[PDB]
Amino acid sequence: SKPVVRVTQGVLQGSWKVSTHGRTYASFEGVPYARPPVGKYRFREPQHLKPWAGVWDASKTLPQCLQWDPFQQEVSGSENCLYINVHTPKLSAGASLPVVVFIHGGAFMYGAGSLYDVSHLMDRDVVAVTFNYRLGPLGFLSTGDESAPGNAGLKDQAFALQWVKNNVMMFGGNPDSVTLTGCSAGGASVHYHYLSPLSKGNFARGIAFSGAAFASWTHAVKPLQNARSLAAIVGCPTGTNRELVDCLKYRPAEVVVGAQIEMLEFPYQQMFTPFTPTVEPQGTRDAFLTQYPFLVAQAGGMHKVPLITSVTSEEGLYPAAVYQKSPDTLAYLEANWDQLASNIFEYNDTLPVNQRAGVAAKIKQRYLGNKPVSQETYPQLVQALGDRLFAVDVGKLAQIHARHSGQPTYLYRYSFRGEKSLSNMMASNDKNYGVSHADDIFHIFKFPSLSSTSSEDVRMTEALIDMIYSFSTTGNPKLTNEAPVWTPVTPGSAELSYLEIASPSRMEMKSSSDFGHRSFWDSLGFVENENYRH
């Protein structure tokens, strides 16, 4: 007899699944949490879902949000994609389990909640929650005015957190013990939820894996320039912002999503998108965010709940791993370094054009010693990209939360290299380039063909899940009993305490005065964070 739950909008029938270690759990997939954002509701904030008649089939995951998938080089999914997936080993309203919510990555351009299998997590007494939010121009169009204020896809997320608060009890989750977690755009997304009034009081604690809302690729400074370009590529007449959004509302969703890749200086190898979170205009009704993330954070405006944030030793394998796919790509980066530095390091909009030559030469000086880009300099290219894109702003996230929150704030550096890496998928080889962006996450979740059953990988899976469970219950994150105590970041210290996770059996407390080599990246004159003005 298949598992059944009533939620606010009606009755769900799910499936019975098995955890990694042979335990039964209830799985409810393809649960709608919002009206389909279709027709006049393309680009608009999520609308309330009208209750459904009869029993809704929650046995299968439903379509991912319509997206440019750069790995498959196609448009895939559907406009009808606002689906949540809820997994419980205790299907009982009185179970009151910690709730682990996961916001997927994909640079706000691609991905899906349904790619992340919760088999490992279901060997613990938590409810796991994955979900879809609108992506690319569908999720993040902005004309910088009431026509398209921006952040639709973050409003989808907030709406999903609101849905979890109102409905997770029926799956045996404690709404008052939600652990909000995410990776890449999802980690940035967790940080965005700390900053927004919309998500205040809707999570007890956070984990931002390899992502912060302070990172340039997570934030659009010139949305109206992006919207006009998209509209022009698609043959929409330029005139009023009203006419622009109206023409985009009536073009096929597939034409609007696919067109983004044809924009001028579109991210090299399509690993990021200009359709990202932005600052919504002043006086926007129920805005997600009306001020630049750094100014909200430094005013102490982040929600006062604990935080784990984290990076891997070779973060830059996103995107640098895709550079190994074609053997011509490193030679192309060498030949065109001066034009493409502002691209791959994502300061297209936050540095004057006349300053690009200068900054390009400083980056090549600092990390490559001015050597040509090649297989020999690949590791330094990876460190450079990982520092700029992920590690620096993860360090600022940890420090600024530790500084303002009055709450335990933890940092980890993951340097365990297991059987498999995300580099395998992105490079299409089995070469070891170190520990990629998301190689820790691929131990918590099963991602298609990036799951291992080696003894050492299985132990890391247990350790990282013990980190989430211990953080969600006691509040003191602990991977193993033998590990030295994980110390929080000291409020107001120039020094950042982090757990260095070399392996499941080897981790110790370390310290950086210059996390991600911030002193270098802060000195290049990017109009970001400490240097931001209107």
Ligand SMILES: *[C@@H]1O[C@H](CO)[C@@H](O[C@@H]2O[C@H](CO)[C@@H](O[C@@H]3O[C@H](CO)[C@@H](O)[C@H](O[C@H]4O[C@H](CO)[C@@H](O)[C@H](O)[C@@H]4O[C@H]4O[C@H](CO)[C@@H](O)[C@H](O)[C@@H]4O)[C@@H]3O)[C@H](O)[C@H]2NC(C)=O)[C@H](O)[C@H]1NC(C)=O
């Ligand atoms: C990265 O940063 C760089 C540096 O700022 C950005 O580069 C700017 O890119 C924009 C285009 O996105 C470009 O703007 C064009 O400038 C020209 C000035 O000579 C204009 O001719 C051109 O106008 C057309 O396009 C507009 C929309 O982009 C329309 O609103 C306008 O009506 C024009 O439309 C005509 O032409 C189109 C085809 O182009 C046609 O289909 C229409 O029907 C119509 O006939 C733009 O305004 C800037 O010049 C660039 N600046 C520099 C210095 O290079 C870049 O956009 C950023 N990229 C990302 C991804 O963020």
